[PDB]
Amino acid sequence: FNILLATDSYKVTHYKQYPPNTSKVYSYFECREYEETVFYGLQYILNKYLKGKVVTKEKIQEAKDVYKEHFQDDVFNEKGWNYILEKYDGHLPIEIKAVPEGFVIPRGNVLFTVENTDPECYWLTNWIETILVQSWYPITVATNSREQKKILAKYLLETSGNLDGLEYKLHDFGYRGVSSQETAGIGASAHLVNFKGTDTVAGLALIKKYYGTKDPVPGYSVPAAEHSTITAWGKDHEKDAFEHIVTQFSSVPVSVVSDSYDIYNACEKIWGEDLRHLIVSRSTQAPLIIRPDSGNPLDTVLKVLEILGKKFPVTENSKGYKLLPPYLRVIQGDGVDINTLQEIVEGMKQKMWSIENIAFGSGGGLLQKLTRDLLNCSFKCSYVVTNGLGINVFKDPVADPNKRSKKGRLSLHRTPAGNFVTLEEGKGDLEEYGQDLLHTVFKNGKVTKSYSFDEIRKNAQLN
C-alpha cells in the first residue's frame, strides 16, 4: 500500500491551487442534513493506512513515475512528500479529532476534523480526504443495521414481552454479495456492532486486530445447508438429504434450506410427517431452523408458519402470540432489507405469530445496497490560515441549500437538554456549552486514543 497513490487523482494537483502563503487547512466530516448515525470505522483506517512511516523514497519515486504518465505531465509534489520523509521520518504531520466510536449522533454534526500540524503541509489535510471519507461505509452499515435492530426490538417486545434473542435476530449473509474481500471484513464488523450473528468470517479477524473483544470471537454461526448440499442427493431424495443433515447435526442448532423444489411440501410432508420424529426429539439448545429462500418474503413466511402450526404443537405465550415448540424455528434469509423486514414483522404480528419464532438473514441488502448519499457523508474545508490570518470558509451552492457546508473552527457539545450541537466559527472557545466532545485520535503519525469493540457496542446500544 502506497498512500501517495491512494487519493483521487486531482488532489495531486491541489498544492498549486490554494492561496499562496496558506499555512493551515482545516476540514471536517459530517453526515449532512436515518435521523441519527453510529460513528464507527475510523480506527480501522487510522491503523491500517495512516499511522507510522507511510512515506519512503521508493514510494515517492513510484508515485512520481505513475503520475507523470497518468497526467502526461509533471505536476506531482515531490518536494512536499520528501519534506515529510526527511523531517518526520515519513510520519504524517496531521491531527485528527473525533467523536468516540460507537457514539450515536444526530445528523448534521461534526463527527471528525482534520488539520495539518506543520505549515509546510497545508496540502496534506485534503490529500487524505479520499481515504478518510471511505469511513462512510462502516458508519452506514452500522447505522442501517441498528435501525433494523430498532424494528426487531419493537416487534419482539410487543409479541413476547421481552428482548431475549434480539442480538441474534438479524444475521449477516453478505460475504458473496459485497464488492471485495476488504469490504466484506469492514461491513461484517459494522454489523457486529449491533448483532452477534455473521457468516462473513472476514469480520472476525478485522475486529480482533483493530478493535479487540474480551470474548474469543465477536460473532457466531451455526451449521446450515445450501442448495448444493440438498440438490446433490437428487430431486427424489430431498427427504434423505434432510434426514442425513439433521442427524449429522443432532446436538447443535441446524439451519436447513427447504425450498429447493417445493417449500410448502417440504414443511408439510417432509418435516411435518416423514421426518417429524427426528424433529420433536431435538433439544431446546438444538432446534431445527427451517429456511425458506424464495417467493414473496412475507407471504412465504406466513404460509410456512401456518403449515408448521398445523403439524407441530404450538402454544400461546403470555402476550397471546403463537409460539412454535422450542425445537423448531424459522429463518427468512431471502429478500430482507430494512423495508421488507418491517413488512414481515408487522405481517407476522397481524396474524398473531411471535417474533420469537423467527430470525432474519440479509446479505447484499445489509452490506452492499448502501451508498455514501444515504447519510449524505461529506468532507469539507471549513477553515484556513493565509498570511497568518484565519478565515472561515464554506460552500453554499445557489441551487442546492442542502449542500451548504459549516464555517470555521468546529466543536461538538452537549446542549442544556442533553442533546448535541455543533458550534461553528470557533464559538466553542467561549465556554458557554461546556467542553468539546471530540478527542484527538491521531497526531503526527500516532494513534492517540482508541476504543475496544466492547466499548463501541456499549456506546451503540439501543435506548
Ligand X SMILES: CCNc1nc(-c2ccc(NC(=O)NCc3ccc(N)[n+]([C@@H]4O[C@H](COP(=O)(O)O)[C@@H](O)[C@H]4O)c3)c(F)c2)ccc1C(=O)NCCN1CCCCC1
- Phi/psi of residue 413, each to 5°? -135, 165
Closest residue to ligand X in the complex (CB): 363
Fill in the per-residue mask, 94 to 133: x = in contact with ligand X (CB under 6 A), - = not in contact.
----------------------------------------
Chosen from its own copies, ligand X, none, partner binding at 23 (C-beta under 5 to 8 Å by type): none
Fill in the per-residue mask, 386 to 405: x = in contact with ligand X (CB under 6 A), - = not in contact.
--------------------
Fill in the per-residue mask, 257 to 286: x = in contact with ligand X (CB under 6 A), - = not in contact.
----------------------------x-
- For residue 250, the 8-state DSSP code is S
244 vs 427, which CB is nearer to ligand X? 244
Q: Which stretch binds ligand X (CB under 6 A): 64-72, 104-112, 219-227, 416-424?
A: 219-227
Per CB under 6 A, the list member of 60, 104, 331, 345 interacting with ligand X is 331
Say if residues 203 and 185 touch (Cβ distance below 8 Å): yes
Chosen from ligand X, its own copies, none, partner binding at 361 (C-beta under 5 to 8 Å by type): ligand X
Angstrom distance (rounded) from CA 205 to CA 298: 35
Angstrom distance (rounded) from CA 22 to CA 387: 6
* Least distance to ligand X, CB of residue 262, Å: 17
**Site membership for its own copies, residue 209 (CB under 8 A):** no
Which is nearest to 389 in space by CA: 9, 19, 12, 3? 19
Length of the chain: 463
Per CB under 6 A, the list member of 192, 289, 341, 412 interacting with ligand X is 289
Q: Tell me how many degrees the CA angle 32-439-140 measures, rounded to the nearest 5.
A: 35
* Least distance to ligand X, CB of residue 266, Å: 15
75 vs 447, which CB is nearer to ligand X? 75
Angstrom distance (rounded) from CA 343 to CA 331: 15
> How many residues bind to ligand X according to rule CB under 6 A?
29
- Edge to edge, the sheet with strand 439-443 lists 389-392, 377-386, 22-31, 112-116, 94-98, 439-443, 446-447
**Site membership for its own copies, residue 352 (CB under 8 A):** no
Q: Which stretch binds its own copies (CB under 8 A): 28-36, 82-90, 247-255, 340-348?
A: 247-255
Consult the annotation and say whether 291 binds a ligand. yes
Angstrom distance (rounded) from CA 366 to CA 172: 7
Segment 131 to 170, residues that bind its own copies, using CB under 8 A: 131, 133-134, 136-137
Q: Which stretch binds its own copies (CB under 8 A): 103-111, 251-259, 320-328, 449-457?
A: 251-259
**Exposure string for 269-295, b = 16+ CB within 10 A, e = fewer:** bbbbeebeeebeebeeebbbbbbbbeb
Say if residues 327 and 246 touch (Cβ distance below 8 Å): no
Consult the annotation and say whether 333 binds a ligand. yes
Which is nearest to 190 in space by CA: 132, 129, 146, 227? 146
Q: Which stretch binds ligand X (CB under 6 A): 37-45, 132-140, 287-295, 388-396?
A: 287-295
Angstrom distance (rounded) from CA 42 to CA 258: 41
Fill in the per-residue mask, 21 to 40: x = in contact with ligand X (CB under 6 A), - = not in contact.
--------------------
Consult the annotation and say whether 185 binds a ligand. no
Strands (E), 218-309: 254-257, 288-291
Helix (H) or strand (E) holding 366: helix 364-367
Q: Which stretch binds ligand X (CB under 6 A): 46-54, 230-238, 330-338, 448-456?
A: 330-338
Segment 355 to 394, residues that bind its own copies, using CB under 8 A: 364, 368-369, 371-373, 379-381, 384, 386, 391, 393-394
**Site membership for ligand X, residue 219 (CB under 6 A):** no
Say if residues 203 and 219 touch (Cβ distance below 8 Å): yes
Angstrom distance (rounded) from CA 94 to CA 3: 14
Angstrom distance (rounded) from CA 322 to CA 316: 5
Fill in the per-residue mask, 18 to 47: x = in contact with its own copies (CB under 8 A), - = not in contact.
xxx-x--x-x--------------------
Say if residues 26 and 125 touch (Cβ distance below 8 Å): yes
Q: Which stretch binds its own copies (CB under 8 A): 88-96, 105-113, 193-201, 307-315?
A: 193-201
Consult the annotation and say whether 293 binds a ligand. yes
Angstrom distance (rounded) from CA 456 to CA 100: 8
**Site membership for its own copies, residue 73 (CB under 8 A):** yes
CB atoms near residue 422 (< 10 Å): 21
Rg (CA), the chain: 26
* Binding residue numbers for beta-nicotinamide D-ribonucleotide: 199, 291-293, 333-334, 364, 372
Q: Which residues bind ligand X (CB under 6 A)?
A: 8, 10, 165, 168, 171, 173-174, 177, 197, 199, 221-222, 224, 255, 285, 289, 291, 293, 329, 331, 333-334, 358-359, 361-365
Binding-site residues for diphosphate, in ranges, read 176, 227, 291
